[PDB]
Design a protein around this ligand. Structure first.
Ligand code: SF4
Ligand code: MG
Lengths: 435, 296
RNA sequence: GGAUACUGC
DNA sequence: TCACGCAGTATCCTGT
C-alpha cells in the first residue's frame, strides 16, 4: 500500500462483480487488453492440447501466467504493492475483454469458456485457508462450523465421512452448505445432513463455485451487449474492441530450389519423376526418403512433403497414413528395430537393387545408356567439352569420377577438392560452395 | 462346397482337369449377370449400395415391412424373367445396417414370426469382432458397441453408453481385473516354425519356437498358437515381446502390457466400428480409454 | 518392394 | 505323395 492503494483487492480470485472506476491511460488500456487476450488464447490452446487435470496443463499454464504477470499464486505475506498492481491488472483487463467479447453469441461463449477454465485452475491452486477466505469474502457461506458444534455432533460427523479417524477427524474442520448444493454427495449418503445443511469436510466444491461464476458472467455479458452503443462512439477503443478476437499476439518449398543445383543427378532424376507423376516405385521411395533424411528434413517435414506430393496422385488421404507412414517413420528409425538408418552410400546405390522399366532409382551414370546420359547432360546446358569428358569417364566405369566431373563443371570450380562417396556429401559440398 | 469345388478345380493348376479358360468364362458371365441386375434395379428407381459377386443390397427407404416384402417379390420376379435356370431370392431383411468397407458390415436380420411381428438377430460379416487374430477383450468391446449402434435408442444416449463402457474397460485393464484368458491372441502357422526367416519379427512363430524348445508335444504347420504380449524390460518392439500364457503365469518378471492392449487392440477395432457414426472419432475413443489423445 | 495373418463371395 | 477358385482388409519390416 504505497501511494494510492486500498482494500479494493482482498483476494487473488474474484468473481469480477464490481466494474473498475479508475481513470487509466490509453497505453495501459491496450497493454492490459492484449495481455489478457494472450492469456486466454494460451488457456484455450492448452485445453485443446492437454487434459485440464494433467500436470503438463498446470505447468504450462503457470509458465504463461508468470510470463504475462497475472495473479496465480497466493502470498501469505500481505498486500504488497506489486501484488496489488497485478490484481488491478487482472480486474481491469477482464472488463476490457468483456467489452471486446459481448458483441456476438459465439464470442460470448468463447469468452465464458476461457474464463471458467482460468478460474478453475486458480481455484485448484488455493490452499484450504485461502479457499475459505475466498468463500467468505463473496458471501458464499460454505462451512465453517464452530468447534463447539463439531464436538456436539462428533459421533455423527465421524460416521458421516468415509475413512475418517478419531484424531485425524479432530484435526479437521467442516463446512455447512445448503443440501441443494451437495446433491452429488447427499444422493449416495456420504455426508451428514442436519436441519437442511450438509457438513462437508475440507474436489466437487469448485464445480458449485464455477456454476455460480458462470451464471454471473453470462448475465454480465448480456448487460454489456446491452450497453454497446455508448462505446462504439469512442473511436480510440473501436479498432481494438471490434477486432480483438482477430488480433495477432529447412522448408519444403526450397527443396525444389535445391533440386536445381545441389542435388546429385540421381536425386534430380528421382525428383523430376516424382513431380511428373506424383508417385514412385519402392526403390525410388527408399532412395529419395533416405536422401531427404540426410539433407535434414525432419520426420514431420518429410511426412508433410510426402503427404502433399502423393495426395495429388488421386489416392485417398487416409491411405497415405495407412501405408506409407510406417515406411517414412522407419527410414528415421522410429519403429521396428528402431535403428537410425544411414543414407545410402554410392557403393550401395550402384550395387543395390538394379532398376527396371518404370523405375528411376540408382546411379544414372551406371543405369543410364551412354546416349541417354549424353542427352541428359546436353539438356542441362553442360559445355560440349564437359559432356564429352563425362561420357569418356563413364565409358571407363568410374561413375563416381563422372559425378565429380559433373560437380566441377556445374559449380564453376576447376577441381572438386573432395572424394565424392555419398550423395549427402554432394549436397553438403554444393551448400558449402553456394551459401 | 462340393459343387463350388467342382467349379474351382477347373482353375486348379495341379488338377487332372485344368481348364482355366472355362473357369474364366464362368466368372466373366457371373460378372455380367451382376452388372445387368444392378442396372435393372436402377431402372426401377431403387438404390443399390453393395454387392459381392452374386448379391445386391437395396435401400428400400421404407419402414412398412409388408410393403418391403412386396417390393422384394416384384423385383425378384422381374430379374427371374430374364433367365431360365438362374434364380434370385430374398436372402434377408436387415432392420438396420452398418456398412463399413467392402466385405465388412453388420446388420440386424429380421426373421418374421407371423401376424406382422418379427424377431431380430444380430449378424456380422467380416468385422474384426469375428476374427481370431484380435484379443477377446477387444472383440467383446466391439460387440457391445455394435449392439449399441444397431439399436433404436436415441443417438446421443447411444454415444453416452459407449463412452461409459469404454471407460469401464479402461479401468478393468488398469487394475488388472480382466481374466488372463481374455488377453490371448491366436494365430495359425502356414509353414513349420523353422521355415519362417523372421523368427524375431513374427510373434506367433516365436512362441511356437519356444514351445518346441520345451519338453512337450511339438507344434507343426496348421496348429494354432495362442500368445500374450507382456513387459520384460527389454525395451523392444511389441512384435518381439510375445510370450505363452503359461510362461506369463510362471515367470516372475513378465506382466501384461496393458498399454499395448489399450492402444493397438481395443482402440483400432472400436475406431473402425465408429468411423461412420457421427459424434465418435479416434481421439475421443482414446480419451475415454485413458490413453493420451495427442498421438491419435 | 516384401513378409504374416483370415474374412468374404 | 499332397494341394478348390479369386477379391479384400489389417499389421509389420528393409545393417553388415
Ligand atoms: S555417383 Fe553417387 S551421387 Fe553421383 S549420380 Fe551416381 S549415385 Fe548419385
Ligand atoms: Mg504397392
Amino acid at each position: 500500500t504505497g501511494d494510492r492503494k486500498g482494500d479494493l483487492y482482498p483476494s487473488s480470485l474474484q468473481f469480477y462483480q464490481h466494474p473498475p472506476t479508475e481513470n487509466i491511460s490509453l497505453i495501459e488500456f491496450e497493454t492490459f487488453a492484449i495481455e489478457r487476450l494472450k492469456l486466454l488464447k494460451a488457456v484455450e490452446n492448452l485445453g485443446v492440447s492437454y487434459v485440464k487435470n494433467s500436470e503438463e496443463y498446470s505447468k504450462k499454464l503457470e509458465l504463461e501466467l508468470r510470463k504475462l504477470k497475472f495473479p496465480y499464486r497466493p502470498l501469505h505475506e500481505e498486500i504488497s504493492d506489486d501484488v496489488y498492481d497485478l490484481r488491478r491488472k487482472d480486474h481491469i483487463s477482464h472488463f476490457i475483454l468483456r467489452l471486446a467479447y459481448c458483441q456476438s453469441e459465439d464470442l460470448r461463449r468463447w469468452f465464458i469458456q476461457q474464463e471458467m477454465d482460468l478460474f478453475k485452475f486458480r481455484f485448484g491452486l488455493l490452499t484450504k485457508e485461502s479457499v475459505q477466505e475466498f468463500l467468505k469474502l463473496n458471501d458464499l457461506q460454505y462451512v465453517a462450523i464452530s468447534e463447539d458444534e463439531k464436538n456436539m455432533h462428533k459421533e455423527d460427523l465421524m460416521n458421516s465421512s468415509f475413512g475418517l479417524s478419531l484424531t485425524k477427524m479432530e484435526d479437521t474442520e467442516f463446512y455447512k452448505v445448503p443440501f441443494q448444493a451437495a446433491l452429488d454427495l447427499v444422493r449416495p449418503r456420504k455426508v451428514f445432513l442436519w436441519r437442511g445443511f450438509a457438513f462437508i469436510p475440507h474436489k466437487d466444491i469448485v464445480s458449485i463455485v464455477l456454476n455460480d461464476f458462470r451464471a454471473k458472467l453470462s448475465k454480465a455479458l448480456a448487460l454489456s451487449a446491452r450497453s454497446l452503443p455508448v462505446v462504439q462512439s469512442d473511436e480510440r477503443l473501436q479498432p481494438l474492441l471490434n477486432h480483438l478476437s482477430h488480433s495477432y499476439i529447412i522448408s519444403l518449398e526450397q527443396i525444389d530450389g535445391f533440386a536445381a543445383k545441389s542435388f546429385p543427378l540421381c536425386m534430380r532424376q528421382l525428383h523430376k519423376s516424382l513431380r511428373e507423376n506424383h508417385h514412385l516405385r519402392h526403390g525410388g521411395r527408399m532412395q529419395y526418403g533416405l536422401f531427404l533424411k540426410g539433407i535434414g528434413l525432419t520426420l514431420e517435414q518429410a511426412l508433410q512433403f510426402w503427404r502433399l506430393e502423393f495426395t495429388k496422385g488421386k489416392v485417398d488421404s487416409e491411405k497415405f497414413d495407412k501405408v506409407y507412414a510406417y515406411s517414412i517413420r522407419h527410414n528415421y528409425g522410429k519403429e521396428g528395430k528402431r535403428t537410425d538408418y544411414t543414407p545410402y552410400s554410392c557403393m550401395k546405390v550402384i550395387l543395390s537393387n538394379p532398376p527396371s522399366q518404370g523405375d528411376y532409382h540408382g546411379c544414372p551414370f551406371r543405369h543410364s545408356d551412354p546416349e541417354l546420359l549424353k542427352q541428359k547432360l546436353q539438356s542441362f546446358k553442360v559445355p560440349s567439352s564437359g559432356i564429352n569428358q563425362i561420357l569418356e569417364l563413364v565409358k571407363g566405369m568410374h561413375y563416381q569420377l563422372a559425378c565429380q566431373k559433373y560437380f566441377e563443371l556445374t559449380h564453376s570450380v576447376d577441381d572438386c577438392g573432395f572424394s565424392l562417396n555419398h550423395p549427402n556429401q554432394y549436397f553438403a559440398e554444393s551448400q558449402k560452395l553456394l551459401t | 462346397l462340393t459343387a463350388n469345388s467342382m467349379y474351382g478345380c477347373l482353375g486348379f493348376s495341379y488338377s487332372r482337369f485344368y481348364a482355366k479358360p472355362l473357369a474364366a468364362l464362368v466368372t466373366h458371365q457371373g460378372r455380367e449377370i451382376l452388372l445387368h441386375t444392378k442396372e435393372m434395379v436402377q431402372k426401377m428407381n431403387l438404390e443399390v449400395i453393395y454387392g459381392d459377386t452374386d448379391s445386391i443390397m437395396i435401400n428400400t427407404n421404407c419402414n412398412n415391412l409388408e410393403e418391403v416384402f412386396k417390393l422384394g417379390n416384384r423385383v425378384k420376379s422381374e430379374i427371374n424373367k430374364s433367365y431360365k435356370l438362374l434364380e434370385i431370392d430374398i436372402d434377408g431383411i436387415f432392420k438396420s445396417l452398418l456398412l463399413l468397407k467392402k466385405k465388412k458390415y453388420a446388420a440386424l436380420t429380421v426373421e418374421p414370426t407371423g401376424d406382422g411381428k418379427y424377431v431380430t438377430k444380430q449378424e456380422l460379416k467380416g468385422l474384426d469382432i469375428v476374427r481370431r487374430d484380435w484379443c477377446e477383450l477387444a472383440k467383446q468391446a466391439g460387440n457391445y458397441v455394435i449392439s449399441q449402434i444397431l439399436s433404436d435408442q436415441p443417438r446421443d444416449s447411444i454415444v453416452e453408453n459407449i463412452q461409459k463402457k469404454l471407460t469401464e474397460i479402461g479401468e478393468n485393464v488398469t487394475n488388472g481385473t480382466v481374466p488372463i484368458t481374455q488377453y490371448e491372441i491366436n494365430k495359425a502357422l502356414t509353414k513349420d516354425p523353422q521355415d519362417y526367416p523372421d523368427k524375431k519379427s513374427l510373434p506367433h512363430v516365436h512362441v511356437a519356437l519356444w514351445i518346441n524348445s520345451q519338453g512337450g508335444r511339438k507344434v507343426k504347420a496348421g496348429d494354432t498358437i495362442s500368445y500374450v504380449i507382456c513387459q520384460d524390460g527389454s525395451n523392444l518392439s511389441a512384435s518381439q515381446r510375445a510370450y505363452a500364457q503359461e510362461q506369463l503365469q510362471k515367470q516372475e518378471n513378465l506382466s501384461i502390457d496393458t498399454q499395448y492392449y489399450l492402444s493397438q487392440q481395443v482402440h483400432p477395432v472400436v475406431a473402425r466400428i465408429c468411423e461412420p457414426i457421427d459424434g465418435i472419432d479416434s481421439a475421443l475413443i482414446a480419451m475415454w480409454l485413458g490413453l493420451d489423445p495427442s498421438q491419435f
